[PDB]
Paper text:
SRs are hormone-activated nuclear transcription factors with distinct specificities for endogenous steroid hormones and exogenous substances. In all SRs, the activating hormone binds in an internal cavity within a well-conserved ligand binding domain (LBD), causing the LBD to change conformation, attract coactivator proteins, and increase transcription of target genes. AncSR1 is the last common ancestral protein from which the entire SR family descends by a series of gene duplications; AncSR2 is the ancestral protein of all naSRs. In contrast, AncSR2 was completely unresponsive to estrogens (and cholesterol) but strongly activated by low concentrations of diverse nonaromatized steroid hormones, including progestagens and corticosteroids and – to a lesser extent – androgens.
We first used X-ray crystallography to determine the structures of bacterially expressed AncSR2-LBD in complex with progesterone and with 11-deoxycorticosterone (DOC), at 2.75 and 2.82 Å resolution, respectively. The structures reveal why AncSR2 did not yet distinguish between progestagens and corticosteroids, which differ only in that the latter contain a 21-hydroxyl. The two protein backbones have nearly identical topologies (RMSD = 0.28 Å), and there are virtually no differences in the ways the ligands are bound. The AncSR2-progesterone complex contains ample room to accommodate the additional 21-hydroxyl of corticosteroids. Further, Asn35 offers a perfectly positioned hydrogen bond partner, which is unpaired in the AncSR2-progesterone complex, for DOC's hydroxyl. Second, AncSR2 evolved an additional criterion: it prefers steroids with a 17β-acetyl group (such as progestagens and corticosteroids) to those with smaller hydroxyls or ketones (androgens and estrogens), as demonstrated by the 21- to 87-fold difference in EC50 values between pairs of hormones that differ only at this position. AncSR2 does not distinguish strongly between progestagens and corticosteroids because it has only a weak preference for steroids with a 21-hydroxyl.
Author numbering:
A (entry chain B): -1 to 247
B (entry chain A): -1 to 248
The structure:
Amino acid sequence: NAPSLISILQAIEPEVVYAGYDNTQPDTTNYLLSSLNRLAEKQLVSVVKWAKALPGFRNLHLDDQMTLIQYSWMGLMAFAMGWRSYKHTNGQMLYFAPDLIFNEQRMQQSAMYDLCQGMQQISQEFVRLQVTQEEFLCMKALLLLSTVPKEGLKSQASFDEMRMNYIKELNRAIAKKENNSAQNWQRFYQLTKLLDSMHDLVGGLLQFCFYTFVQSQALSVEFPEMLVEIISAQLPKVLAGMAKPLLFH
Amino acid sequence: NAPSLISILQAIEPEVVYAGYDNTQPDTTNYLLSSLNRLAEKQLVSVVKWAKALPGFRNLHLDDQMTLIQYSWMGLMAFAMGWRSYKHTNGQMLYFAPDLIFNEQRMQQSAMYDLCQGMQQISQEFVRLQVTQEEFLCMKALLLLSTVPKEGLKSQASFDEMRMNYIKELNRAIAKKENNSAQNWQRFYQLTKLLDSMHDLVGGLLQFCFYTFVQSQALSVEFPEMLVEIISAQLPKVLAGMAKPLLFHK
Ligand SMILES: CC(=O)[C@H]1CC[C@H]2[C@@H]3CCC4=CC(=O)CC[C@]4(C)[C@H]3CC[C@]12C
Ligand SMILES: CC(=O)[C@H]1CC[C@H]2[C@@H]3CCC4=CC(=O)CC[C@]4(C)[C@H]3CC[C@]12C
């Protein structure tokens, strides 16, 4: 056979990115929120390299490629962050970058606190289910494919296929580790139910992101160049409500 | 909107068939089996009427239609039978027809007794699960679609899509109960798992049917005309192993 896409997912998985954060700084709301936005920009390049290499993706209309990234960029970063929080801190802390990690204090100072808790719960869920690296990588792919234009895509031809495979390949992963079907059947629930749960969270994250952005002047936080563009394009579409989450349940 | 798949399903559900059995007769292996085979013929005709009226069915290539039936005819009848046995006897007895119902003694004389038990366990599942009539109708539609030719279908064009609709429809039916996603997922698991259990049973039934078919002279068990051909046509394909059951997990 040809290489399993899972084996390719592993190959194209990005290496971790540093924030270039200065940890001697007092933890100040504005400074935290801004360095986070710096991090996002760096990660934004990473996730885009990734999606390109992501099998099936290039075969979508570039307006399709462009929209999917626009919607899901937040969820993918947040999801991946929760998986780092799990491997490194055991869901105890929010591990954004090896050099910027949110302890309790920082979550309170972020003025994102309730949103931080929410992200943390995603991480703890990872530790509760003991998600395997394979499960994670498949899930993260599906996340990309889990929010779509309310009016459907140009490549919907290609898309519905791709989405199916990554669902299939997710099954291939739940099946391999475990053995019994009663088990497979419930794994699949808990995992997909985890993916679904991401949507509500992202909404909240976005809500605040948008807010910080519009009020960036007043609040005095900085969104860097590349980051603005993406938000700028996304903000209107999602407020228009052209963005449809695809649930499992 | 346009009428529910499930509302059509209900419309086209066959009325119950009578066997025309003389219950004053003694309960004897040959008269019992022969009488079932008469019942199987009568049901056979309505099963086919049913499948035609089944939405998305006539859109399948006509070889696919004939194939699928030959495969699942046994499972449909036995599935339906266990449903009746749940509705009328509460899983207690085997209600093939209102006039011919197997109680313990008849399962003894049947000389299929371990199979009778098997079928009695299907109905008992219906009762353990408290299956709704809507759940039942969707499952029975799928049962048609759950054993396919191993080589594939001429138009798998349509089939795959149709099969999904009935799966969606089945979810539409579980959801109605107003449960949450986890209960729904659990209903779904336990239904399709009742479904899948059907093959094991049916395999066994086919076997003893094939047997009684061949040995009828020996056994003095008479297969009405129309029952004969379907078996004639099916038996080869089966023993060649060209029939692939479609499961919901191993
Ligand atoms: C400054 C601001 O509005 C906050 C709101 C939500 C925050 C983001 C939440 C998800 C997250 C995961 C990461 O790995 C770093 C960047 C991001 C993408 C965060 C960057 C800073 C954000 C953008
Ligand atoms: C004589 C014989 O081979 C028996 C073996 C199993 C029996 C069948 C079991 C399933 C059953 C359900 C019905 O409602 C009547 C017909 C049938 C289809 C039965 C017809 C007679 C059978 C076929």
